[PDB]
PDB file of C-alpha atoms in Angstrom:
ATOM      1  CA  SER A  22     -13.250  25.474   0.346  1.00 10.76           C
ATOM      2  CA  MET A  23     -16.984  24.784   1.176  1.00 11.24           C
ATOM      3  CA  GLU A  24     -17.055  22.185  -1.740  1.00  8.64           C
ATOM      4  CA  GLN A  25     -14.035  20.206  -0.011  1.00 11.13           C
ATOM      5  CA  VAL A  26     -16.111  20.218   3.147  1.00  9.33           C
ATOM      6  CA  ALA A  27     -19.244  18.957   1.600  1.00  9.14           C
ATOM      7  CA  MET A  28     -17.183  16.084   0.045  1.00  8.65           C
ATOM      8  CA  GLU A  29     -15.735  15.168   3.285  1.00  6.27           C
ATOM      9  CA  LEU A  30     -19.149  15.104   4.833  1.00  7.06           C
ATOM     10  CA  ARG A  31     -20.171  12.631   2.094  1.00  7.22           C
ATOM     11  CA  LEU A  32     -17.097  10.497   2.993  1.00 12.27           C
ATOM     12  CA  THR A  33     -17.900  10.611   6.664  1.00 15.71           C
ATOM     13  CA  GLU A  34     -21.480   9.443   6.029  1.00 13.45           C
ATOM     14  CA  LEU A  35     -20.294   6.878   3.705  1.00 13.78           C
ATOM     15  CA  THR A  36     -18.004   5.716   6.534  1.00 13.60           C
ATOM     16  CA  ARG A  37     -20.916   5.504   8.852  1.00 14.85           C
ATOM     17  CA  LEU A  38     -22.936   3.282   6.533  1.00 14.08           C
ATOM     18  CA  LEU A  39     -19.814   1.095   5.839  1.00 11.66           C
ATOM     19  CA  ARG A  40     -19.255   0.630   9.609  1.00 11.64           C
ATOM     20  CA  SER A  41     -22.868  -0.806   9.930  1.00  9.30           C
ATOM     21  CA  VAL A  42     -22.459  -2.970   6.720  1.00 11.92           C
ATOM     22  CA  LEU A  43     -19.082  -4.226   8.312  1.00  8.08           C
ATOM     23  CA  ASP A  44     -20.814  -4.995  11.650  1.00  8.05           C
ATOM     24  CA  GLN A  45     -23.590  -6.836   9.931  1.00  7.72           C
ATOM     25  CA  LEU A  46     -21.078  -9.018   7.795  1.00  8.31           C
ATOM     26  CA  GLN A  47     -18.858  -9.734  10.832  1.00  8.84           C
ATOM     27  CA  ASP A  48     -21.948 -11.145  12.575  1.00  7.70           C
ATOM     28  CA  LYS A  49     -22.111 -13.695   9.893  1.00  7.22           C
ATOM     29  CA  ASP A  50     -18.694 -15.049  11.131  1.00  8.17           C
ATOM     30  CA  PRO A  51     -19.592 -16.026  14.634  1.00  8.30           C
ATOM     31  CA  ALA A  52     -16.526 -18.447  14.728  1.00  8.08           C
ATOM     32  CA  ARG A  53     -14.288 -15.478  14.230  1.00  8.92           C
ATOM     33  CA  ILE A  54     -12.292 -17.318  11.541  1.00 10.15           C
ATOM     34  CA  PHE A  55     -11.939 -13.943   9.586  1.00  8.99           C
ATOM     35  CA  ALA A  56     -11.499 -11.503  12.395  1.00  9.54           C
ATOM     36  CA  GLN A  57      -7.747 -11.150  12.287  1.00 10.75           C
ATOM     37  CA  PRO A  58      -4.875 -11.437   9.723  1.00 12.42           C
ATOM     38  CA  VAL A  59      -3.570 -14.802   8.943  1.00 12.09           C
ATOM     39  CA  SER A  60      -0.403 -15.242  11.227  1.00 13.08           C
ATOM     40  CA  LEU A  61       2.854 -15.665   9.220  1.00  9.71           C
ATOM     41  CA  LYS A  62       4.375 -17.097  12.360  1.00 10.47           C
ATOM     42  CA  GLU A  63       1.756 -19.971  12.275  1.00 11.83           C
ATOM     43  CA  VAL A  64       1.366 -20.208   8.435  1.00  7.34           C
ATOM     44  CA  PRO A  65       4.935 -19.183   7.244  1.00  7.08           C
ATOM     45  CA  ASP A  66       4.124 -20.068   3.658  1.00  6.85           C
ATOM     46  CA  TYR A  67       1.049 -17.972   3.356  1.00  6.04           C
ATOM     47  CA  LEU A  68       2.442 -15.160   1.218  1.00  7.85           C
ATOM     48  CA  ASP A  69       3.603 -17.696  -1.277  1.00  8.20           C
ATOM     49  CA  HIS A  70      -0.030 -18.560  -1.853  1.00  7.30           C
ATOM     50  CA  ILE A  71      -1.951 -15.340  -1.089  1.00 11.03           C
ATOM     51  CA  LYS A  72      -0.793 -12.104  -2.455  1.00 10.30           C
ATOM     52  CA  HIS A  73      -3.135  -9.843  -0.917  1.00 13.13           C
ATOM     53  CA  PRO A  74      -4.190 -11.081   2.543  1.00 13.22           C
ATOM     54  CA  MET A  75      -7.208  -9.515   4.048  1.00 12.98           C
ATOM     55  CA  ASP A  76      -9.448  -9.747   7.215  1.00 13.65           C
ATOM     56  CA  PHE A  77     -11.995  -7.739   9.330  1.00 14.05           C
ATOM     57  CA  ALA A  78      -9.502  -6.029  11.595  1.00 15.97           C
ATOM     58  CA  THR A  79      -7.567  -4.674   8.675  1.00 12.90           C
ATOM     59  CA  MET A  80     -10.679  -3.627   7.047  1.00 15.98           C
ATOM     60  CA  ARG A  81     -11.847  -1.816  10.387  1.00 14.19           C
ATOM     61  CA  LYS A  82      -8.363  -0.044  10.371  1.00 13.80           C
ATOM     62  CA  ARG A  83      -8.918   1.204   6.753  1.00  9.75           C
ATOM     63  CA  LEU A  84     -12.520   2.148   7.498  1.00  6.81           C
ATOM     64  CA  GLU A  85     -11.717   4.229  10.551  1.00  8.01           C
ATOM     65  CA  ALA A  86      -9.120   6.286   8.537  1.00  9.26           C
ATOM     66  CA  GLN A  87     -11.996   6.875   6.114  1.00  8.79           C
ATOM     67  CA  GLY A  88      -9.942   4.997   3.512  1.00  7.09           C
ATOM     68  CA  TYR A  89     -12.856   3.511   1.520  1.00  5.38           C
ATOM     69  CA  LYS A  90     -14.086   6.193  -1.017  1.00  8.42           C
ATOM     70  CA  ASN A  91     -16.920   4.157  -2.380  1.00  8.91           C
ATOM     71  CA  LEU A  92     -18.824   0.765  -1.865  1.00  9.50           C
ATOM     72  CA  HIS A  93     -16.777  -0.852  -4.679  1.00 11.28           C
ATOM     73  CA  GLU A  94     -13.552  -0.553  -2.582  1.00 11.01           C
ATOM     74  CA  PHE A  95     -15.059  -2.006   0.610  1.00  7.98           C
ATOM     75  CA  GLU A  96     -16.613  -4.915  -1.406  1.00  7.45           C
ATOM     76  CA  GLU A  97     -13.185  -5.587  -3.119  1.00  7.73           C
ATOM     77  CA  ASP A  98     -11.676  -6.087   0.495  1.00  7.31           C
ATOM     78  CA  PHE A  99     -14.627  -8.338   1.666  1.00 10.25           C
ATOM     79  CA  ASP A 100     -14.245 -10.401  -1.482  1.00  8.88           C
ATOM     80  CA  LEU A 101     -10.577 -10.824  -0.806  1.00  8.45           C
ATOM     81  CA  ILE A 102     -11.353 -12.252   2.662  1.00  7.57           C
ATOM     82  CA  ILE A 103     -13.784 -14.890   1.050  1.00  8.49           C
ATOM     83  CA  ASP A 104     -11.583 -15.576  -1.998  1.00  8.73           C
ATOM     84  CA  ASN A 105      -8.180 -15.968  -0.245  1.00  9.45           C
ATOM     85  CA  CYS A 106      -9.804 -18.509   2.208  1.00 10.61           C
ATOM     86  CA  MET A 107     -11.344 -20.399  -0.648  1.00 10.10           C
ATOM     87  CA  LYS A 108      -8.028 -20.821  -2.481  1.00  8.83           C
ATOM     88  CA  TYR A 109      -5.747 -21.648   0.488  1.00 10.43           C
ATOM     89  CA  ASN A 110      -8.223 -24.070   2.105  1.00  8.23           C
ATOM     90  CA  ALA A 111      -9.772 -27.261   0.571  1.00  6.53           C
ATOM     91  CA  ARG A 112     -13.534 -27.702   0.127  1.00  7.95           C
ATOM     92  CA  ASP A 113     -13.740 -30.150   2.957  1.00  7.31           C
ATOM     93  CA  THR A 114     -12.415 -27.625   5.645  1.00  8.77           C
ATOM     94  CA  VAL A 115     -14.210 -25.665   8.257  1.00  9.21           C
ATOM     95  CA  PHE A 116     -12.336 -22.659   6.868  1.00  9.50           C
ATOM     96  CA  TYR A 117     -13.572 -23.021   3.339  1.00  7.49           C
ATOM     97  CA  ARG A 118     -17.090 -23.752   4.436  1.00  8.36           C
ATOM     98  CA  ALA A 119     -17.151 -20.659   6.843  1.00  6.51           C
ATOM     99  CA  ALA A 120     -16.183 -18.603   3.780  1.00  9.23           C
ATOM    100  CA  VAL A 121     -18.976 -20.009   1.618  1.00 14.47           C
ATOM    101  CA  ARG A 122     -21.520 -19.144   4.429  1.00 13.69           C
ATOM    102  CA  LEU A 123     -20.035 -15.702   4.927  1.00 11.24           C
ATOM    103  CA  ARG A 124     -20.382 -14.920   1.164  1.00 13.68           C
ATOM    104  CA  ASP A 125     -23.936 -16.236   0.873  1.00 13.51           C
ATOM    105  CA  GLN A 126     -25.062 -14.343   3.882  1.00 12.86           C
ATOM    106  CA  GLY A 127     -23.068 -11.241   3.096  1.00 13.52           C
ATOM    107  CA  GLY A 128     -24.671 -11.053  -0.338  1.00 13.23           C
ATOM    108  CA  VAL A 129     -27.967 -10.116   1.281  1.00 14.36           C
ATOM    109  CA  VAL A 130     -26.447  -7.256   3.209  1.00 10.27           C
ATOM    110  CA  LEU A 131     -24.386  -5.875   0.463  1.00  8.39           C
ATOM    111  CA  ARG A 132     -27.438  -5.928  -2.067  1.00  8.27           C
ATOM    112  CA  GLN A 133     -29.209  -3.439   0.223  1.00  9.40           C
ATOM    113  CA  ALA A 134     -26.152  -1.537   1.111  1.00  8.35           C
ATOM    114  CA  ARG A 135     -25.707  -0.719  -2.665  1.00  5.72           C
ATOM    115  CA  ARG A 136     -29.360   0.484  -2.953  1.00  6.39           C
ATOM    116  CA  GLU A 137     -28.780   2.721   0.025  1.00  6.43           C
ATOM    117  CA  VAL A 138     -25.476   4.197  -1.211  1.00  6.81           C
ATOM    118  CA  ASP A 139     -27.013   4.883  -4.632  1.00  8.92           C
ATOM    119  CA  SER A 140     -30.336   6.138  -2.950  1.00  9.35           C
ATOM    120  CA  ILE A 141     -28.724   8.497  -0.414  1.00 11.25           C
ATOM    121  CA  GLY A 142     -25.958   9.381  -2.830  1.00 10.50           C
TER     122      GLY A 142
END
């Protein structure tokens, strides 16, 4: 149907805006601490701690399959990146501190992304 096409075009356009949001967030991680999944070979206990691992590569795979239907879904995954790191790692660690900085800086970007998603529809 034409209605299904129109919905698909909205999803595609949301995908474009989320790709740009994703790029901007990832630039706030120049150390590349959050670039890839935590390795279970190198942190064998990880899944005993963290039930839903997340990372920027995994988000990028979902994004390219148009797997985020709305901004809320994408923000949920971004928050997992931060929240997981802040639980597994102590306050005095480079990992924890990197997450705090990513969260603080990412807030700015997400604030205007929400306006854009509402504004454009």
